[PDB]
Design a protein around this nucleic acid. Structure first.
Lengths: 66, 114, 79, 177
RNA sequence: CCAGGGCUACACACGUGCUACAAUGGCGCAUACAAAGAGAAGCGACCUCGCGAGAGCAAGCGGACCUCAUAAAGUGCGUCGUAGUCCGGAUUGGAGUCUGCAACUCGACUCCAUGAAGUCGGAAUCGCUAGUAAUCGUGGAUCAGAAUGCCACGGUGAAUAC
RNA sequence: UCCUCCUAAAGAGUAACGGAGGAGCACGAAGGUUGGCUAAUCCUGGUCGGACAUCAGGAGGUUAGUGCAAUGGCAUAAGCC
């Protein structure tokens, strides 16, 4: 690369809430502290929530009850 | 912080700061901070990281910002494609809870442009 | 919204639907009871509820079981 | 380059048996990742442009190339040579370091992430993706920013077909819809 | 005579109101001082359940004794710190309660979520001379249910008239 | 008055109140050189983004470009940096 025209690209440490602590290189400045990550995101359960659209006739059976 | 997807207020107490999430008002936020063991008079700046995490799983018990909007919009689209009376007034854009339209209902109908 | 202790159905239509469900797919069932709910044994039946002058046919799906019969007959017509 | 040796050891054998390639020079490699950010309001102010150039430099780590208007368009009231966009080409090690940082740190921060499209391929193995909100990259702190300023990312791979291109990204858990 | 629908429609214009746009305020907690009136196919304690609207059980009262019925502005203390903001509450979604044969058209109310217009209003124009204007709550008739209307009642309480 | 094409009859030239258009400059780089580069218009994909900006790829092969009219020329580029 050219010198002295690029941002300070240093190695920082990123710690998510799920426990995945990872070592990257970025211009944050140091010590990024995350909340969610790749193995913390609900892409395996949370994507399916409104996919479960629910019924309408069972709601009737939750009100008829007989 | 980043509670449930967004949450960057500051200088506010946590009962009012939590209400920035689409899906929680003053009484649901009091239920969050009671179940989290957090006093309601604290700012978000004075929150330790050992307190922000126990709100994130606490707020995850209620349908909030992301999957709430697609829930509400589908239920409207459930009515509008049903052809029912409330769905019919949702289409034209007119009040659906059985209130007058002779003189009022500027909220549903926007401004009086002509 | 109303009447937790039992949903409401007209007996004039409840007797009419129990005869018609064991008789299969028939002609449209004329009725005037807009105030009655739509029970789940009515799915597929072409009920014709009254809207004031006509008997407009509604085709009952499963999505319309919590609702009442009059929600599918707009009584007022507009430009 | 934590994904590059993950590519060089896990992916290239997982893909060569996937497509029964006769040699290791047939498997698609990702050559470059490029970061466009079409400003288009620099006609109004030529200070909104280099504000939109600093945060690309904060996301990437290298100084961006300010792109110029090519032909001339009066439907958008631009003329030739006007600075309209801002791009970053990432090759080599910083392409890999951006690739791990996108799929582990940036894409989980997306407001209502539901899965990236599998229909977003050009038909030649290249994958493109818009991001519509720059704040998910943690290099931009939330307080200093004044505009949303979304960008778009297009990954150039040496895949002949996009069916192989979709298989290449899936080996990196580039998740999908 | 009957059932269902309409009287509640809605590109718009007007009248009379209600609630606002906040700090002389909002919210949280604690706490003080009324008058008038209604009540028996009615008012409904206490107790128990429910976050709540309410429900169950149910005394008492044709009433200066029983119930509706904790008046609210006030005052203390805390917080908010001038932001479309802890202002404002429309609208909409979901979940309910009650009345009634029945709440879709087309009831009131509660709960959760939502949180729009609005930052004092053009030309114009209205009311008011003292316990008045303003502001705060309460009751009644009509009524199965359904008022911000109407008719009453008290609380605090001005300014100005050459 | 000057420039370009046609009339003009395959060298040159050639008329008409014949058919079409331009010029009375610009440029201190738009000149010199060295080094580099290759267009138009579509197609698909892609945040705002739209027939039409900016990206990526493919097709295409100069239909682009030339400070200025037209003809001749131009990839060794005379086009672009």
């Amino acid at each position: 690369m050219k010198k002295d025209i690029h941002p300070k690209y240093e190695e920082i440490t990123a710690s998510c809430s799920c426990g995945n602590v990872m070592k990257i290189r970025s211009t944050v400045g140091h010590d990024l502290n995350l909340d969610v990550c790749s193995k913390c995101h609900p892409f395996f359960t949370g994507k399916q929530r409104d996919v479960a659209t629910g019924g309408r006739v069972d709601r009737f059976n939750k009100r008829f009850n007989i | 912080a980043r509670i449930a997807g967004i949450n960057i207020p500051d200088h506010k107490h946590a009962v009012i700061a939590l209400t920035s999430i689409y899906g929680v008002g003053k009484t649901r936020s009091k239920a969050i901070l009671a179940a989290a063991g957090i006093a309601e008079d604290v700012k978000i700046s004075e929150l330790s990281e050992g307190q922000i995490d126990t709100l994130r799983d606490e707020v995850a018990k209620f349908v909030v910002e992301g999957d709430l909007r697609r829930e509400i919009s589908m239920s409207i689209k459930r009515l509008m494609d049903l052809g029912c009376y409330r769905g019919l007034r949702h289409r034209r854009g007119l009040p659906v809870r059985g209130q007058r339209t002779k003189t009022n209902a500027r909220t549903r109908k926007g401004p009086r442009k002509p | 919204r109303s009447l937790k202790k039992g949903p409401f159905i007209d007996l004039h239509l409840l007797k009419k639907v129990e005869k018609a469900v064991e008789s299969g797919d028939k002609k449209p069932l004329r009725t005037w009871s807009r105030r009655s709910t739509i029970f789940p044994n009515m799915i597929g039946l072409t009920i014709a509820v009254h809207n004031g002058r006509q008997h407009v046919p509604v085709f009952v799906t499963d999505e319309m079981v919590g609702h009442k019969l009059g929600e599918f007959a707009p009584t007022r017509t507009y430009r | 380059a934590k994904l590059h040796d993950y590519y060089k050891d896990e992916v290239v054998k997982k893909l060569m048996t996937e497509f029964n390639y006769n040699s290791v020079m047939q498997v698609p490699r990702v050559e470059k990742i490029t970061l466009n950010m079409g400003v288009g309001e620099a006609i109004a102010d030529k200070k909104l442009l280099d504000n939109a150039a600093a945060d690309l430099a904060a996301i990437s780590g290298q100084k961006p190339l300010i792109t110029k208007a090519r032909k001339s368009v009066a439907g958008f009231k631009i003329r030739q040579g006007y600075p309209i966009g801002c791009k970053v080409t990432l090759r080599g090690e910083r392409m890999w370091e951006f690739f791990e940082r996108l799929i582990t740190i940036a894409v989980p921060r997306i407001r209502d992430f539901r899965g990236l499209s599998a229909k977003s391929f050009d038909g030649r193995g290249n994958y493109s993706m818009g991001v519509r909100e720059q704040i998910i990259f943690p290099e931009i702190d939330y307080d200093k920013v004044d505009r949303v300023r979304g960008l778009d990312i297009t990954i150039t791979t040496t895949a002949k077909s996009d069916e192989e291109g979709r298989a290449l990204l899936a080996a990196f858990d580039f998740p999908f819809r």
